[PDB]
Design a protein around this ligand. Structure first.
Ligand code: FES
Ligand SMILES: [Mg+2]
Ligand SMILES: [Mg+2]
Lengths: 111, 232, 98, 133, 25, 220
């Protein structure tokens, strides 16, 4: 599991590496872009591997590092969502919203 | 140290219960194995826990491995605790006669220094509870689970002196032979006190047990009764 | 201060007596295709079918005339120690209250 | 965490025994509120029992004097063609008018049930209420 | 209180149903 | 923190009605909401007999004088719990009022569970929510029965987890394990709306009073 500090350090390292690559390839660091990153990394590290993922890649850290650390309550322990104890707060909240819309309407190529 | 016998699991201590998911520690609790049985293979264990101050419980744990069964039983027991009222923190408040299924248990309150003259499992459970003086007789089927269940029900359903005083609205006065005719008030009603005395029942319609009477009158001749035994 | 006994004694529901074959005024409060849910002042609502005659006039909030048959439909069944209730009243829809 | 023996005592007695025994470090948030304002009955589990023999429920049937009048009214003039409005807290049915007139005549005259009924019918017809037997 | 209910037999009790030959020889 | 405790958490417990919940309802209001209308005598539960005024043409009538005292106690308990920032969970399996109860819970800043109750919400909460989940301090049953006319499992589970319960109990319900039962009609929409209104008002007033007392104590 990756802590926020780890991702922060990866962000700083990525910025420094971006400037280093821009210096290496002779472009201006200020205007150096991610498409430029891809082109430069492909040139400096040629790779014929068919799997585009397998080929060497330099990306912004968050694009690889996934995150599903959704915390559902605070320090006091009170859950944020009023449907928390159902265990399916998002689904039942959506169902509740749809039911309310249907009540309002009753008062009044694709898949 | 051995249990009730050299090769028996019963009476063996399992140590304190593990710290719970709730975040509570139980270093003041002791665990004792009451039964281990092969289930046809897996193992079913009956264990009891208690802190020696009235908080006690029991549980069944089933698992393929014996140690897993011990752990499950102990952890479940700590979360199903009874509180047992003790008279002067050494005995029960009154005589208790109970029947759970086919197992009959007859317990007698005793003075200090009497010790635990009870079935070995009852001795273990009493040590876990903190009862130090009591007599007990088990009759009918001697089934360990039924014995434990009946014992815990009977000990959890005992009426304290304060409860009796509040119920009858009267002083509960204790007469001790060692203290002469001095009246010792052990409980007084919290609310108002009735001015009318209890009916002086000429002969109460109490259900007597033939064993107690026969022992009192001296016709009990058992060679197994009142035998010298190690301190319990 | 009016006691509960007085309110019960002078209540219209208490005054109605037996509910069998009594004409009442109910209000439609829910529509499910051709199912009309009507409140008439009782504990339970009654569900009626939309009449084939002037069925468009039966809408939410409409006042209707009903013949009550039972305030709550219950019945004890074989091998049961308590009655089974459908949580519904029985009534016949007569028409719209003019 | 507390004892999960919901059939022994109540939540209050279990919690109190555990707290005084030192098992629980702190009282739960509701313990003090329960102390200050206890319920009328302590919530102790009890197993409902089927009645047998001569035991009967102590629930009585709610009857009033005028019910008799109502019954016989409903047996003679039948159910009024007028419709009851139970939503109105002060609805007044034809039968209720008959009852009030019957009681008025009872307190202003003698006690003869048939005579009271016929006289009340005459009075209602005089007032202008239709009553088909 | 005078508004309390009072004990009586059910006045709305419908008569028990009879067969077509009830009371006939 | 001793002064904080004594002035904020212990002070409200010295008054019989600290939040003035008695002015929120009257026997007249309960009668007008049809709170006294129970089920037929064939559906009666034995433990509900002391709360029944009588049977009117085989329909049980709930004694509203007792309902008033029971509701006073239940509302007082709810208000005191909300003042102490306790988690309050409303539970009801009557689908006719699921939307209303969820709206009410969202409005008063409390929690609702009107859906299928999965085995182990309360007795197995650590596994199903997380090791540090906080359970409700109070559970309020608008309907204590499930759709098969048996007790809501949450009643027994709350008793197991030592969570006090307030509950609306009709004539066919079992009030033995509910900490603060309130005898009343649980079927008519008027009665349910009244219950929701009363509980919402009590909770919001208690929370406002807590904030006001905090502000006054901080100022002085
Ligand atoms: S009912 Fe048959 S003889 Fe009367
Ligand atoms: Mg040996
Ligand atoms: Mg109901």
């Amino acid at each position: 599991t990756y802590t926020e500090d780890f991702i922060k350090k990866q962000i700083e390292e990525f910025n420094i590496g971006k400037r280093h690559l821009a210096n290496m390839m002779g472009e201006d660091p200020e205007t150096f872009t991610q498409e430029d990153i891809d082109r430069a990394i492909a040139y400096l590290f040629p790779s014929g591997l068919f799997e585009k993922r397998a080929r060497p890649v330099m990306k912004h850290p968050e694009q690889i590092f996934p995150r599903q650390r959704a915390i559902q309550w605070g320090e006091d322990g009170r859950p944020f969502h009023y449907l928390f104890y159902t265990g399916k707060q998002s689904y039942y909240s959506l169902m509740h919203d749809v039911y309310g819309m249907l009540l309002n309407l009753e008062k009044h190529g694709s898949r | 140290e051995r249990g009730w016998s050299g090769n028996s699991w019963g009476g063996i201590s399992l140590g304190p219960p593990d710290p719970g998911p709730c975040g509570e520690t139980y270093e003041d609790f002791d665990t004792r194995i009451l039964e281990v049985r092969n289930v046809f293979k897996s193992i079913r264990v009956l264990v009891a826990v208690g802190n020696g101050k009235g908080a006690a419980g029991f549980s069944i744990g089933k698992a393929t491995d014996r140690m897993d069964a011990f752990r499950k039983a102990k952890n479940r027991a700590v979360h199903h605790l009874h509180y047992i009222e003790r008279y002067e923190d050494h005995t029960i408040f009154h005589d208790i006669s109970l029947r759970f299924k086919r197992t009959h248990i007859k317990m007698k309150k005793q003075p200090k220094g009497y010790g635990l003259r009870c079935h070995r499992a009852i001795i273990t459970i009493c040590r876990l509870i903190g009862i130090k003086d009591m007599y007990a007789k088990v009759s009918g089927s001697i089934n360990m689970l039924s014995l434990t269940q009946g014992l815990f029900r009977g000990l959890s359903r005992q009426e304290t002196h304060q409860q009796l005083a509040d119920k009858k609205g009267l002083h509960v006065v204790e007469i001790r032979e060692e203290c002469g005719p001095l009246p010792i008030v052990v409980a007084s009603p919290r609310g108002p006190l009735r001015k009318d005395p209890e009916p002086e029942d000429e002969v109460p319609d109490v259900k007597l047990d033939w064993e107690d009477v026969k022992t009192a009158q001296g016709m009990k001749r058992s060679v197994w009764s009142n035998l010298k035994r190690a301190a319990t | 201060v009016e006691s509960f006994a007085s309110m019960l004694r002078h209540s219209p529901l208490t005054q109605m007596g037996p509910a069998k074959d009594k004409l009442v005024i109910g209000r439609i409060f829910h529509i499910v295709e051709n199912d009309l849910y009507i409140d008439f002042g009782g504990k339970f609502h009654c569900v009626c079918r939309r009449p084939e005659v002037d069925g468009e006039k039966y809408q939410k909030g409409t006042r209707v005339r009903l013949r009550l048959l039972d305030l709550e439909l219950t019945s004890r069944f074989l091998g049961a120690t308590t009655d089974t209730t459908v949580l519904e009243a029985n009534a016949v829809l007569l028409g719209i209250q003019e | 965490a507390g004892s999960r023996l919901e059939t022994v005592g109540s939540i209050f007695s279990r919690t109190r025994d555990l707290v005084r025994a030192g098992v629980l470090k702190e009282k739960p948030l509701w313990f003090d509120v329960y102390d200050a304002f206890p319920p009328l009955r302590e919530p102790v589990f009890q197993r409902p029992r089927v009645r047998y023999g001569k035991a009967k429920a102590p629930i009585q049937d709610i009857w009033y004097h005028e019910d008799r009048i109502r019954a016989k009214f409903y047996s003679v003039y039948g159910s009024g063609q007028r419709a009851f409005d139970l939503f109105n807290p002060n609805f007044k049915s034809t039968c209720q008018r008959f009852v009030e007139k019957y009681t008025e005549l009872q307190k202003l005259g003698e006690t003869d049930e048939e005579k009271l009924f016929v006289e009340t019918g005459k009075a209602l017809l005089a007032e202008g209420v239709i009553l088909r037997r | 209180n005078e508004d309390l209910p009072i004990s009586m037999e059910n006045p709305y009790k419908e008569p028990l149903k009879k067969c077509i030959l009830c009371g006939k020889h | 923190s001793t002064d904080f405790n004594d002035k904020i958490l212990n002070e409200p417990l010295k008054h019989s009605d600290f939040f003035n919940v008695k002015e929120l309802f009257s026997v007249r209001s309960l009668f007008d909401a049809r709170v006294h209308l129970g089920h037929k005598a064939g559906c009666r539960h034995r433990f509900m007999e002391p709360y029944i005024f009588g049977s009117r043409l085989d329909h049980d009538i709930i004694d509203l004088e007792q309902t008033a005292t029971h509701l006073q106690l239940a509302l007082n308990f709810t208000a005191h719990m909300a003042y102490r920032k306790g988690i309050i969970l409303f539970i009801s399996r009557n689908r006719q009022f699921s939307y209303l109860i969820e709206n009410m819970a969202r409005d008063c800043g409390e929690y609702a569970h009107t859906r299928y109750f999965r085995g182990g919400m309360l007795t197995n909460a650590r596994l199903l929510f997380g090791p540090t989940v906080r359970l409700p301090d109070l559970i309020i049953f608008l309907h204590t029965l499930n759709n098969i006319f048996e007790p809501h499992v949450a009643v027994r589970d709350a008793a197991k987890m030592n969570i006090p319960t307030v509950g609306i109990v009709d004539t066919n319900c079992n009030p033995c394990l509910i900490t603060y039962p309130v005898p009343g009609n649980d079927d008519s929409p008027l009665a349910v709306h009244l219950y929701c209104r009363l509980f919402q008002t009590a909770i919001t007033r208690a929370k406002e009073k807590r904030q006001q007392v905090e502000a006054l104590y901080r100022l002085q």
